[PDB]
Design an enzyme around this catalytic site. Structure first.
Site, short mmCIF file in Angstrom:
data_model
loop_
_atom_site.label_atom_id
_atom_site.label_comp_id
_atom_site.label_asym_id
_atom_site.label_seq_id
_atom_site.Cartn_x
_atom_site.Cartn_y
_atom_site.Cartn_z
N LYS A 1 -2.22 -2.12 -3.36
CA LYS A 1 -3.32 -1.37 -2.76
C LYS A 1 -3.06 0.11 -2.94
O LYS A 1 -2.54 0.78 -2.05
CB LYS A 1 -3.49 -1.70 -1.27
CG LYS A 1 -4.54 -0.85 -0.57
CD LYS A 1 -4.98 -1.46 0.75
CE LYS A 1 -6.03 -0.59 1.44
NZ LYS A 1 -6.50 -1.18 2.76
N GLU B 1 0.78 -1.21 0.00
CA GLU B 1 0.00 0.00 0.00
C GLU B 1 0.83 1.29 0.00
O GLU B 1 1.25 1.75 1.01
CB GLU B 1 -0.97 0.03 1.17
CG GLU B 1 -2.04 1.05 1.10
CD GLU B 1 -2.88 1.23 2.33
OE1 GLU B 1 -2.91 0.41 3.19
OE2 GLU B 1 -3.52 2.22 2.43
C1 LIG Z 1 -8.32 1.82 8.19
O1 LIG Z 1 -7.08 1.55 8.79
C2 LIG Z 1 -5.97 2.44 8.70
C3 LIG Z 1 -6.10 3.65 9.66
O2 LIG Z 1 -4.82 4.00 10.14
P1 LIG Z 1 -4.00 3.04 11.22
O3 LIG Z 1 -2.70 2.38 10.44
O4 LIG Z 1 -3.47 3.96 12.48
O5 LIG Z 1 -4.84 1.96 11.74
C4 LIG Z 1 -5.55 2.84 7.26
O6 LIG Z 1 -4.46 2.00 6.93
C5 LIG Z 1 -6.64 2.54 6.20
O7 LIG Z 1 -6.67 1.15 6.02
C6 LIG Z 1 -6.33 3.19 4.80
O8 LIG Z 1 -5.05 2.85 4.34
C7 LIG Z 1 -6.56 4.72 4.76
O9 LIG Z 1 -7.95 4.95 4.77
P2 LIG Z 1 -8.95 3.94 3.90
O10 LIG Z 1 -8.75 2.38 4.41
O11 LIG Z 1 -10.54 4.36 4.11
O12 LIG Z 1 -8.58 4.08 2.49
#
Ligand SMILES: CO[C@H](COP(=O)(O)O)[C@@H](O)[C@H](O)[C@H](O)COP(=O)(O)O
Ligand SMILES: CO[C@H](COP(=O)(O)O)[C@@H](O)[C@H](O)[C@H](O)COP(=O)(O)O
Ligand SMILES: CO[C@H](COP(=O)(O)O)[C@@H](O)[C@H](O)[C@H](O)COP(=O)(O)O
Ligand SMILES: CO[C@H](COP(=O)(O)O)[C@@H](O)[C@H](O)[C@H](O)COP(=O)(O)O
Lengths: 350, 349, 349, 351
Positions: free
Chosen positions: B229, B187
């Site tokens: 991703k 990602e």
């Molecule tokens: C949703 O989980 C993640 C939030 O940040 P943390 O690493 O502190 O848990 C984030 O990785 C998220 O999966 C996404 O990469 C960014 O937002 P979206 O999942 O809605 O695209």
């Protein structure tokens, strides 16, 4: 990271249209772009003098072959001399090629030169005055170009330097071509010299092609307006292990799938040292390989289209028709092969 | 360069089989891998305390929805804590997921850290002891992993340093994952923050993915046993210029075609700040784009699978069914979307 | 390329001041930073059990040797455990070191890990939470740090990947240290293993150091606030050809002159398995090498300062003075060596 | 990686000896290598026609100044035409230069060309047949060469592409030169155009030089047999903030200290758009800068050695001596500057 577009939408469209015409279904490229020195070797092997008239006659022989080649030949690559030569009927050779449905191509590199501090490795020269040369060639009927870099598999080769420097020069050549409406064929040739096996070729091919496309990205090359001219993945000439054409196909197509972005319009294989029939069979196996292949897979063949024609001709005018017959037959064979319709009539191991 | 195979044919087959299972046709990924601090924000927006029991209950709610999600969901990404929690029936969450046809995924990064000398840019940490963690995760039911790098489009960003360093750390993580039979989801998220237009996002996305794949090559990553991703290619969040979904799809599919080798098994888009509906419409448009697309194009949605489930739950045990219903609707919507079956001059790109 | 200064002028002055103190004329570094498993080996070599108390005692023995060592020792590198131990009189070891005129250093890497798809090559881990660790170490008295990367000369090594990845993680470590007021000692050790000759070592050393310094520039490292800890350039261990100390010195200094910017404050060589005498004699020849040398050339010795002291100690408390005496003589010898005062055709390079 | 020496000890010795001779103490370089199109703009600024004889005459004027220049001038860079021209007494210009104790240098690049997809950035062409050209130039008396790349400070420049590509082609050129016994002067010029301040130029200069030396390392260049020809670190030409000569010197020497390996034999600064006096005072401040400087710090000046001489000549045969006196004056000024011993048209900005 700011965009300063190298090309307008109109220029992109032009380059994509050219690249697609060249590798349209059923079609490949005749590589007739041997330099004076290189075609000398060719004429010498049939006891024929290296004169401008003999070169013109031989090129004429190929280019004016009967209309059976028309559906087979999407492009012809010429050396500078030939681009400005004429058929017996007064027609410029580029006009001959176009009248038979082929795009005209020009080789623009100026040969290899030694990379100091390496084990016999080279880079390729020819950038100087290249934009002016391409503008002129464009005006005189050419729509694509060819530049050949050469790499060797050995104990300490290809080195990081050779890989990086050849990828870099290829990208510069591509950038200049596209500024002048010329589709660049990118040729990073890995020689088959040596006794390495199929998977060593596959590994080096994958590394070389990764470097090539990173350089093209860095230099802002429009992939859709390019073609790739790689070696097939094969064992070294002196390798003792034998492989089937199915294994050559699989290894080749796996290497490409791992490195060549889908936006690339087509891959036009060089034939290397392969015999005429071998090159046709492999290209056919490559197109029958069951993996997804999101680019045209066809030929840009010199020896593999000409070897018999050159022989049958022997430098004698009365042989003209039999020599042309030899060329037309390889043209027909490879047209079928680039569709996987040629008849002589475990992925994870890669 | 000489070959010193990272993986045997049997290791390759395992990884490839896993990656294909996750993105089999009509399937996508549920991203429920929010860390404690991140899920805290979720629960806060619904006036719910951030306790381990509320975290366990919310995840249970998502993971035990009815069997209509089974064909929609190829994978579910969890945060460490959740991987070792259990549903009310005593079954470990990994078992719940597997019993519903799902592959278990585990987020393994430890968050972004500042790169000094840059204008607010970051890399991502989490490599230390990663191999031992991966071996244990594998043993405890996980078959894929996730690692998030974050880049931002701005005046002088993403810089060459940020691009190079995030690409490099992603490669290190992928390499370690593959050594332990875990499929790495790669990602490299380019945030939508800012007022840049669609083509600037397309340009940055193309430069970023070229770097990612060169790095994956330098580190000998087996692409067939990876997933990508990325962000979709969209205008910045505050961009004054407006675009259609078809343009978003064209810019996206073009960026990927110019950078992502066919060998990559699948692309599972993050939803970003897109609403549930927008995320589905765009994914559907992308799959309807008229170009050749030699990888699965599907979803790894967090917010866009969860927004309405969370709101309908509201923190109340008795809203379980209605919340699970909202999640099932978004799962079904996106399953159709990654097939291009969801109804609610390309030389210019 | 726009500057977003990593460091203020005040932060730079601090780092530069620390660096210069550590390698003041006549001064070098005692490397007493062997990890638990490393010091274990050392203790078994004298039949002494690896308990925390014996480690504490041995470290005490080195750290409290008499004041003859003060002008010799600009810095002492400690492993985490030792930074928080106390001498018999209650004084924290850092206080001990500092009352004797030395700067306190802390090894912060977490050891090597395997790089997949290479011929047995490694990178080094230890970045996770590094910033927080450095701030705590700084608060607790450390002013510099050490991080060891390890490369090997062989048929296919060190590879492009090994060289790039180790340069890069070194730069990350350096960046984080400097954010926290800690001078990073950058140690890209090329092992002496194998039968390669002197010119091969010189060639690999020049390539590795060029990569290191390019990585440091890419990551905006303030070179004045750093030290370099490389191998000396020497033939491999198994090499049949014989070289004089003068040729080793010439090769080493030539290598450094071609790669290390003058801005680097000092070069503190690792001893790398050379005997005590050999290590001193080579450092001496290095400092007498007639070429221009715009950085301090001194020592950061572990084994070459300790081998005889560890032997004279043999784990018996009552050998304290005989042991310390052995260390003090190597401290004295090496302080002379880094002044070119120790006595027990450059185009060819 | 494995070594396949680019050069033998004998070749290294030759290249090292040449490089040291050019920048021996007190000595610098006269850059008389303006191409046909550039010298033309020079001659235009004094109503002189751009003919082969006028160019020949003007170059003679500089090369045959009295023997006071001999200890000031370690090298003279020529354009191809001039290399094969003769003074009035029939001596080839290279013979003239050697007889006065100078090494002969040849500019071998073929000018800048646009990099597509950039904001007005260039790389430099000239590698084709360079080896053959170098072998010939060596035979005909040249012992070093010059190749100029050009970079520009702006909002998006220099770009990563421009920096990498320019550093790479410089490395290719350096490699080819050394294979033919020619010392390459590596010139990565960062233009002083724009209104950036001192520290911005210092930052860009450090980044560009780090890349140049990485490239040179990748291409196996022997640094002891090279010279570097960078811009001095200065504010932009349109920068409102003002700086002292001590500050320019500090920023310049700091930038060099952080990037240029000690093995490099010398640094021969380009004058840029600096006046003749500005160029000498800065060069002097640089050499007095109280930091350790492990390379010769001297000049390779075009405009800053020639401005007054050009104006005094005015294209008139009879102004020969008057012109030569202006040149000799700048040459003596700069020989002192590159020793830190210099104390003050020579004031007119040459931007
Ligand atoms: C949703 O989980 C993640 C939030 O940040 P943390 O690493 O502190 O848990 C984030 O990785 C998220 O999966 C996404 O990469 C960014 O937002 P979206 O999942 O809605 O695209
Ligand atoms: C002979 O043709 C080219 C090599 O010699 P020159 O560069 O001096 O002309 C070469 O580019 C050739 O066209 C390609 O490698 C393709 O030919 P093959 O299909 O025979 O490998
Ligand atoms: C003091 O020894 C250190 C041990 O390292 P690890 O605990 O990570 O195994 C060693 O790294 C030392 O700091 C330097 O490498 C120099 O030590 P030597 O002078 O013995 O080569
Ligand atoms: C900057 O380049 C050299 C030094 O010039 P200045 O000291 O006046 O800045 C100089 O040799 C310059 O390259 C030539 O005078 C002009 O070169 P071209 O012929 O490529 O225009």
């Amino acid at each position: 990271p700011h965009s300063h577009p190298a090309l307008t939408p109109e220029q992109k469209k032009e380059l994509s249209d050219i690249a697609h015409r060249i590798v349209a279904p059923g079609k490949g490229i005749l590589a007739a772009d041997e330099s004076t020195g290189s075609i000398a070797k060719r004429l010498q092997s049939i006891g024929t003098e290296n004169t401008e008239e003999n070169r013109r006659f031989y090129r004429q022989l190929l280019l004016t072959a009967d209309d059976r080649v028309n559906p087979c030949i999407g492009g012809v690559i010429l050396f500078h001399e030939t681009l400005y030569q004429k058929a017996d009927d007064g027609r410029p050779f580029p006009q001959v090629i176009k009248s038979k449905g082929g795009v005209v191509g020009i080789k623009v590199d100026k040969g290899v030169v030694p990379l100091a501090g390496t084990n016999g490795e080279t880079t390729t020269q020819g950038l100087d005055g290249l934009s002016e040369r391409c503008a002129q060639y464009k005006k005189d009927g050419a729509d694509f170009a060819k530049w050949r870099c050469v790499l060797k598999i050995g104990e300490h080769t290809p080195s990081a330097l050779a890989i990086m420097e050849n990828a870099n020069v290829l990208a510069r050549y591509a950038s200049i071509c596209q500024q002048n409406g010329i589709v660049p064929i990118v040729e990073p040739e890995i020689l088959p010299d040596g006794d390495h096996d199929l998977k060593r070729c596959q590994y080096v091919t994958e590394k070389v092609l990764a470097a090539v496309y990173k350089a093209l990205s860095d230099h802002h090359i429009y992939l859709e307006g390019t073609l790739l001219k790689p070696n097939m993945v094969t064992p070294g000439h002196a390798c003792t292990q034998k492989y089937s054409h199915e294994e050559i196909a699989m290894a080749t197509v796996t290497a490409l799938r791992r490195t060549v972005p889908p936006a690339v319009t087509g891959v036009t294989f060089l034939s290397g040292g392969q015999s005429e029939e071998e090159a046709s069979i492999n290209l056919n196996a490559i197109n029958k390989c069951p993996l997804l292949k999101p680019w045209a897979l066809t030929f840009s063949y010199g020896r593999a289209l000409q070897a018999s024609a050159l022989k049958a001709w022997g430098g004698k005018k009365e042989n003209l028709k039999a020599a042309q017959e030899e060329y037309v037959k390889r043209a027909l064979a490879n047209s079928l092969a680039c569709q996987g319709k040629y008849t002589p009539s475990s992925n994870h191991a890669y």
